């Protein structure tokens, strides 16, 4: 399979901040067939990005996909309360579809 | 317009089988796929396989093929995931997700991206 590696696995951030999330592929993802999903607690995954950079209708434009080949990036600007969730990438450039292990975007609490 | 609704949570003994259902409404009359995705507790997402109900074509992930059966009833736009012999490892939320077709026309290879999801079905293996 194409192994997709999202790291780091957790990122601690504040509201208003920009988040960059990386997805790296063990092989080239054909035709940039890479999607991103947001999953809030208790909820089903929701599609944010497909074709690497395409945004479904009804997804806010602060979500942006970029990259190609083996190196893909989701950028979330102006983090809103709602955006603290787990984010997954997915390649479907081969018939055996695979997901990354997920990146948790969580609020940075002063310890 | 497209909505996917799954059958309710189930509790099952080890060695038993269970069948989870996913009913799709709305969308265009087309060769869409309904795929099944596993999420174990605290864990990530894994594609198990899928079916195109219009054409009775099924597609499995190799690591799941030996232990599951995926079918569809095309007249009710309902896809089914049977887990054939349950173990504790099989405790998970199972999601259905719909792959649409690409390009003009009702008839085409499903895209691999999942634009629509069911609410999930928790399967708990007791004992």
Residue numbers in the entry:
A (entry chain B): 1 to 27, 27A, 28 to 110
B (entry chain A): 1 to 52, 52A, 53 to 82, 82A, 82B, 82C, 83 to 100, 100A, ...
List sentences quoted exactly from the publication behind this structure:
An effective prophylactic AIDS vaccine will need to generate anti-HIV neutralizing antibodies (Abs) that target the HIV envelope glycoprotein (Env) and broadly neutralize as many HIV isolates as possible (bNAbs). The HIV envelope protein (Env) consists of gp120 surface subunits and gp41 membrane-anchoring subunits assembled as noncovalent trimers of gp120/gp41 heterodimers to form mature, functional ‘spikes’ on the virion surface.
In the complex structures, HCDR3 forms the back wall of the epitope binding pocket. One of the ordered sulfates modeled into the structure sits near the middle of this concavity, coordinated by the guanidinium group of R94H and main-chain and side-chain contacts from S28H. While lipid cross-reactivity mediated by HCDR3 had been suggested to play a role both in inducing B cell tolerance and in increasing neutralization potency through interactions with viral membranes, mutual functionalities precluding an engineered solution, our results alternately suggest that viral membrane binding is so weak and nonspecific, and competes with HIV epitope binding, that it is unlikely to be involved in the induction of tolerance mechanisms or to play a key role in neutralization. Three types of IP3R were identified as top-scoring PhIP-Seq hits and validated by SPR.
